[PDB]
Amino acid sequence: ITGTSTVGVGRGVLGDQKNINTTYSTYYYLQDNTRGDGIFTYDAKYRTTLPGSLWADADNQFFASYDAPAVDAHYYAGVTYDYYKNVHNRLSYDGNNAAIRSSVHYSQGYNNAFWNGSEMVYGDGDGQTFIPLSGGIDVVAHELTHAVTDYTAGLIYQNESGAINEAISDIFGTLVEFYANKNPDWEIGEDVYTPGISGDSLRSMSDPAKYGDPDHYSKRYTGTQDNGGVHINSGIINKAAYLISQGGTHYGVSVVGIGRDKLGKIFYRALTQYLTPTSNFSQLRAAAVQSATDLYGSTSQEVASVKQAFDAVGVK
Ligand SMILES: [Ca+2]
Ligand SMILES: [Ca+2]
Ligand SMILES: [Ca+2]
Ligand SMILES: [Ca+2]
Ligand SMILES: [Zn+2]
C-alpha cells in the first residue's frame, strides 16, 4: 500500500500492550515500512486461501480480540528481523531485505503455524491444545528461520537433514526469545501451548526426553512417520546445542558451556557456509567444528566444547 508511516497500539494474544508500525492510507494497515522491503500482515478470515486481505483498521488501535493474533504476528516478525539484522548482519530471510508476509486466522481451530515457502501462516488453535500461535515468539522465530534455511543451506525436509532443519529453527527460535528477553527459556511453544496446563511445552531443548524425544543418537527414531522423525530426532541436536551453550554432563560426558552468543555465531556460520541440502548429523558436527575453528581457532575451548557436546549425544 502507498501511504504514510505511523505507529499504532494494540494488545497481543497474552494481553500485553505494544506499539506496532502501521501505514496510513484512508485505513491504517498492518504494513511496517521501517524494515527492509516491509513486513505485511494479512487476515485469512478463517479460510485457507492465502494470503487473504492486507489487515486494515479504521483507527490504528488494535484492542479487539480478533486483532490480537495480527498484532503479535506483525510485531514478532519485526523482532525476528531485528535479531537477524543486529546480531548476524542478515537483511531479511534472503539476505536482500525481501518483504515478510504473514496471514493470521487461517482456517478454523487450526493447531499449527508454518512457513509455506513464500510466507508465514498462523492458525488460531482450538483453544485447548493451543491459543493463536503467533502469541509465541519462539514459534514465530522458529518458523521464520525455516525461510533463512531455505535460502542458505536448503536442508531437505526429511530424515536427518530435516531433523537438522528443525533443530536449527528451535535453536534460533530460542535465541530470538532470549534476545527479546521475553521470559526466556529452553522449551518451545510454552506461551501458546495448552492454556489449561502450566509448566509444559511442545519440546524441550535442555531435556528432550521429558516429552519422549531422543537425547542421544542411539535413541533415534528410524521409522517413516513425521518424514522420518524430523520433529522427533531434532531432540538430539537440540540437546547438543543446549550443552554447547549452557554446559553439563550428559551420559557421562562433561561439556563446558560457552554461552548463547557463541552458540548462535557458530551455528549461523555452519548454516550459511558449510551445510548443504543433504547434510546429515555427522556432517553437521564437522560443519560446527569447522565454524568454531574459523571463529575461535582450532585449539580454543569453543572448539573443544563443540566436540564434547556432539560426543555426549553420540554423534561422530
Ligand atoms: Ca481499531
Ligand atoms: Ca519463554
Ligand atoms: Ca520458549
Ligand atoms: Ca501449557
Ligand atoms: Zn519447523
Q: CATH superfamily name of the largest domain?
A: Neutral Protease Domain 2
The 3D shape can be described as globular
- The total of helices stands at 8
Instruction: Measure the end-to-end span.
Output: 52 Å
Here the CATH topology of the largest domain equals: Neutral Protease, domain 2
Q: Any guess at the CATH architecture of the largest domain?
A: Orthogonal Bundle
Helix and strand pattern: EEEEEEEEHEEEHHEEHHEEHHH
Number of strands: 15
**CA-atom Rg in angstroms:** 20 Å
CATH class of the largest domain: Mainly Alpha
> Which structural category fits the helices and strands?
alpha+beta
> What is the domain total for the residues?
2
PDB class: hydrolase
Keywords: hydrolase, metalloproteinase, organic solvent
Assembly: monomeric
Entry title: thermolysin (60% isopropanol soaked crystals)
Summarize the structure in words.
With 316 residues, the protein is of the alpha+beta class. It has two domains: 6-154, Elastase, domain 1; 155-315, Neutral Protease, domain 2 (Orthogonal Bundle), CATH 1.10.390. Helix content is 37%, strand content 17%. The protein has eight helices and 15 strands. The protein has helices at residues 68-88, 137-151, 159-179, 225-229, 234-246, 260-274, 281-296, 301-312; strands at residues 4-11, 17-25, 27-29, 31-32, 39-43, 53-54, 56-57, 61-62, 100-104, 113-115, 120-122, 187-188, 203-204, 248-250, 253-255. The strands form four sheets. Strands 4, 5, 6, 9, 10 and 11 form a six-stranded mixed β-sheet that branches. It has a five-stranded mixed β-sheet with strand order 7-3-2-1-8. Helix 1 packs across helix 2 (137-151) and helix 3 runs parallel beside helix 5 (234-246). The longest helix has 21 residues, at 68-88. It is globular, with a radius of gyration of 20 Å. It starts with a strand and ends with a helix. 50% of the residues are buried. The site of one calcium ion (CA) has 6 residues, from loops. One of its GO terms (molecular function) is metalloendopeptidase activity. Its cofactor is Ca(2+); Zn(2+). Belongs to the peptidase M4 family. Zn(2+) binds at residues 142, 146, 166. Keywords: Calcium, Hydrolase, Metal-binding, Metalloprotease, Protease, Secreted, Signal, Zinc, Zymogen. It is classed as hydrolase.
